[PDB]
Structure 1
């Protein structure tokens, strides 16, 4: 049974989400505040996080960012702002997917299912870089590496076809499966983070320091 953390300050909505998700065979835990959410996210070992917006956006964005902070956990954000800008903001800040309010319980079960679907291939490799597309685990130079789900999926996409160069639109379409509006910076921002977590500093010698 997969576990879901619901971070929702509106208690009526939290209850409805609990009923609906529980009825689908998920174990559900509730956090009534951004702070309780951060704490449970780090301790309860959830398989997925649902986050419904209620703060000003400096805080709200910070929350998404903090939950995203070196975490492999998928995050879905509920928003009432039905705009291209909002979708680009959330995916850019590290949400794996958004859901526009108001919505039907089935729209929710569907997005949730996408995020929690069973793995695929075996461990991928390229030199001493290894990805296990199941534990969503990756190691490089012996050192285990913490990628977000989208970082992981992008790295996997590149490694499966090493000689291939994908266009921004190609990666956007493949990785977010239609959910990311075109023309944005989201792919670039994810690449920049991938380079930072992976790219080797210049210099190679027999002795190499890190």
Structure 2
């Protein structure tokens, strides 16, 4: 499983990366949503975990960009208590889930695992449909 992790808090990002890696995830951490987005595509087999607030492109801006690329590429928003209402609205808008700070390591893991599961199922579904069409065309 893979994760693109974005947060402006250097220390929090490192703690989050270590937790995810020890949980079996391959993590790519970024200090900027823009840099992270550059590596994303509808072919990305992982998930995105981003703070809702960033000094540059914020978390919701990144979310909208991801939604356009592939609505089934899960985005988990990391948020402070004050912004929870915004995160809840984002979920209604298509975001996968949110995790409120401060959060426990095992909780970050359970949230990421649910998102990875959705992405794994979506990619498996697409792979199966590709095979069906490939077989159908051959015949």
TM-score, structure 2 normalization: 0.74
User: Does the 8 Å contact 1:31/1:37 carry over to 2?
Assistant: yes
Change (3 A) 1:28 1:83: closer
Shift of 1:84: 6.3
Match of 1:116 in 2: 116
Structure scoring higher RCO (CA < 8 A, sep ≥ 6) equals: 2
CA distance in 1, matches of 2:52, 2:84: 17
Q: Which residue does the alignment assign to 1:25?
A: 24
Which structure has the highest helix share of the two? 2
Give the 5 Å matches for 1:58-207: 59-71=58-70, 72-81=72-81, 85-117=85-117, 134-137=123-126
Larger radius of gyration: 1
Distance 1:118 1:74 in 2: 8
Q: Distance in 1 between matches of 2:83 and 2:125?
A: 31
1:68 Cα deviation from its structure 2 partner: 1.8
Cα deviation digits, residues 154-182 of structure 1 (max 9, x gap): xxxxxxxxxxxxxxxxxxxxxxxxxxxxx
Unaligned runs of 5+ in 2: 130-139
Find the counterpart in structure 2 of residue 50 from structure 1: 49
Structure-1-length-normalised TM-score: 0.51
In structure 2, how many angstroms separate the alpha carbons of the residues matched to 1:34 and 1:119? 20
Task: Tell me if structure 2 keeps the 8 A contact 1:41–1:49.
Answer: no
Match of 2:61, SS?
helix
2:84, 2:100 within 8 Å by CA — same for their partners in 1? no
Provide the residue aligned with 1:3 in structure 2.
Answer: 2
The alignment covers a number of residue pairs equal to 126
